[PDB]
Amino acid sequence: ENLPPHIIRLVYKEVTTLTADPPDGIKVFPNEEDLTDLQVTIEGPEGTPYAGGLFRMKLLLGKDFPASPPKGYFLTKIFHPNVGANGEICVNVLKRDWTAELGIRHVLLTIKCLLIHPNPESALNEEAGRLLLENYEEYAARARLLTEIHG
Numbered sequence: 001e002n003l004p005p006h007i008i009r010l011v012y013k014e015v016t017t018l019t020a021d022p023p024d025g026i027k028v029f030p031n032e033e034d035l036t037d038l039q040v041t042i043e044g045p046e047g048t049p050y051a052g053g054l055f056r057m058k059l060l061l062g063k064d065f066p067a068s069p070p071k072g073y074f075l076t077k078i079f080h081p082n083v084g085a086n087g088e089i090c091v092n093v094l095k096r097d098w099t100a101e102l103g104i105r106h107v108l109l110t111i112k113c114l115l116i117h118p119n120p121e122s123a124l125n126e127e128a129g130r131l132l133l134e135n136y137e138e139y140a141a142r143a144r145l146l147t148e149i150h151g
């Protein structure tokens with residue numbers, strides 16, 4: 001398409017490998033019609049305020065993938081410093097150490113890991129970031145309540 005044939009091949013193969021052998025806690029649900037839009041679920045890790053939740057999310061392979069990371073959104077509502085009001089996952093965090101040799105597997109691991117260790121210094125959710133830093137117990141409680149409803 002607007003993606004080079006070698007990127008198409010590499011994406012399709014990497015998505016197949018993710019269907020068969022995903023990171024623990026992660027499942028992928030490829031769309032046969034749009035290679036560029038990938039639905040994913042991530043289990044809220046134990047030992048975090050997201051424990052027990054199943055978080056639906058999607059990746060959109062934009063203009064400049066793999067020069068830039070895919071765009072990520074949580075579809076499951078969440079109270080997390082790095083997730084904005086439309087469910088967008090902070091681009092600046094996803095871009096840390098990004099190079100074009102990275103792919104979908106790294107993006108999904110980075111998101112899963114972000115549930116365990118948020119980065120409130122790059123807060124899209126200003127209140128989440130503030131509470132995490134100033135009153136963690138209240139951050140955790142808000143996040144646990146939302147996880148009970150939405151996860």
Ligand code: NA
Nearest residue numbers: 117118119120
């Ligand atoms: Na962090």
